[PDB]
Design a protein around this ligand. Structure first.
Ligand SMILES: CCOc1ccc2c(=O)[nH]c3sccc3c2c1
Lengths: 198, 197
């Protein structure tokens, strides 16, 4: 099911592909980033081609598309991370068990930002020994969501008398969402890695 | 969707009570009675969860490719309290839900080789009516190593490639009595046994 615009990977399962400025693919990511992070400068943007993460993510997307009633289930969001975590995320994706406590907690899961400026905080995208910061652009299955709460280890039930029928994700604010939290593996696909500097 | 499943009238989730004395019920009963013959089986249900099955079978194919052989799958037991049964039937096994009982070999979901281990009251807690609950689980144990307290993922299969991981951890690699998996969709709950002491 691998997208036909991916580079041939030669029976390999994983590749990072460096994008070229001037191509729509690079430019649209650069614009979405500079919308809120105009003070930073992009070193490079890599497309993440991970066959196994993509398959598991696309199965979860198909299931959420079946379960929800013609919803836009998927948002393109940002995730800042430290250099030490990039090889793990590239290969294995986002693991809630490794997640940091966010300054404002809406549950114990993986946090994704609407605005690059949030992900660009040194607390999330820690500068490496060479001053480089790292941010993923991520396809996230936000689905149907509600305002979260610090206590959550899964999304809350839509109905308290049906505890197993869950919201797909939670947010800080349902009228103006600026962050989303997901609580399951393969609910987020790391699509691009932005390397950037002051 | 597997053969031994029965029709679901286009539904994606059904719990199907097995008939005592037919081959499927007899096979699952015998796996339990190997170590739990002193317990009384009230019923066995086949868990038909299309989404959990799909995600599990994807992970199974991936592990068959990664390990370059089959034999990544084992049948194991998981005792749970009555309150968690609806969650497990619909959403499977969540390492984030595991309390202080799921400790010692890592922060994952624990599966027992022997039904006797899962039959302990600390795991299969008797409900107000005295009923205990244990799953028979298809688990992708794959290539495993000894676990230790505090693991959030299995160790690497070589500290020179830190991201190529073991699939699971155990108490004992030569004679395993339990397995811990650290990822969703590595365990498919196949049967639920309701039983009493
Ligand atoms: C060393 C602990 O190993 C095990 C082995 C089996 C089980 C089990 O069947 N159910 C549950 S529910 C919470 C913990 C456990 C558990 C833990």
């Amino acid at each position: 099911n691998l997208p036909e615009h991916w580079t041939d990977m030669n029976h390999q399962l994983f590749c990072m592909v460096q994008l070229e400025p001037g191509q729509s693919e690079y430019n649209t990511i650069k614009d979405k980033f500079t919308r809120t992070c105009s003070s930073y400068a992009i070193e490079k943007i890599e497309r993440i081609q991970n066959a196994f993460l993509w398959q598991s993510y696309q199965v979860k997307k198909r299931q959420m598309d079946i379960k929800n009633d013609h919803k836009n289930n998927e948002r393109l969001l940002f995730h800042g991370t430290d250099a030490d975590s990039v090889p793990y995320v590239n290969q294995h994706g986002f693991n809630r068990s490794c997640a940091g406590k966010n300054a404002v907690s809406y549950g114990k899961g993986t946090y994704f930002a609407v605005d690059a400026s949030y992900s660009a905080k040194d607390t999330y995208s820690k500068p490496d020994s060479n001053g480089r910061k790292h941010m993923y652009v991520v396809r996230v299955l936000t689905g149907v969501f509600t305002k979260g709460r610090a206590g959550l280890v899964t999304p809350p039930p839509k109905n308290p008398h049906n505890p197993t029928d869950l919201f797909d994700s939670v947010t800080n604010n349902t009228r103006s969402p600026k962050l989303f939290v997901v609580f399951f593996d393969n609910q987020a696909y790391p699509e691009y890695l932005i390397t950037f500097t002051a």
